[PDB]
Amino acid sequence: ACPAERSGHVAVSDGRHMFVWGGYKSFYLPREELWIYNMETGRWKKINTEGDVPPSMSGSCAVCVDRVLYLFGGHHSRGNTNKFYMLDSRSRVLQWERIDCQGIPPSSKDKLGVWVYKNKLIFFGGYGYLPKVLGTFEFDETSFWSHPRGWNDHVHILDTETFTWSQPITTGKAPSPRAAHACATVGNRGFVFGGRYRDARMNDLHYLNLDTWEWNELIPQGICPVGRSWHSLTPVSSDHLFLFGGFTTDKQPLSDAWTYCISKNEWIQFNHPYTEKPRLWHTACASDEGEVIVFGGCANNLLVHHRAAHSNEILIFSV
């Protein structure tokens, strides 16, 4: 029992079960399928969901808060969306619910990132159509020749107490607009690393203070990882982020792994047995046993669609 290979899916976890949905391969994976990976046993279970099932999408943004799945955005066969769904997995047959949220939602987009803080889901960045909204938008000129698309640096809050969208008034210098960056939350710090913007897959590291809404840039002393998009960034402790895979400005698929030590502001390269298994647009989830479970994604330049090496392998890192 194993799910088909795919890139651009979502994977969220409670530390024990990892829920996999969506993505595409070589096209979109079946919308009603929810794959559950037991991190302790290593076994899969497919279930068919009901209710307001989202369309099959890549680049959607999902979270698991107290075993409630939330999903925003993505790209389906007719383009980007800004719909918001929730799937309670706490129990019966799982039923999707499309949440008609109050307030101004974000623009339709995919390949963004989210931080979870108290009752708030905080979404940053992504790629989609021209957006009233705070922040900046920057067109992708390769989309001009349909609807043009571009990157944003937008921060949006969905307050789960009321399912109301809003935007915080931030201080500091936001990261540039970007997509396929990776976000990770530790405490009240929402970290974002890398991502694609114009002609670069970037190497910069920021966090947004989720209490005071101040942006900070982190300059680590010493060797930093090469700039990338489509990588994963995973909290593995109150003081370490785990970086794996991605895709460089020069289209190199990556298999390096690093841990960022927050308190020392330092990157440490991480040796592992998958140096011959680069992955981009995979997912990664931390286990309660201190592991990082990488699933899916593409082993080569997925931009050459007819040659794309999509994967269904589980990679287990012991951090």
Binding site: K111, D140, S143, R149, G150, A180, R196, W230, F247, W281
Partner: peptide, 6 residues
């Protein structure tokens, strides 16, 4: 399609 902008 899905991969643009990354």
């Amino acid at each position: 399609g899905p991969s643009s902008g990354g």
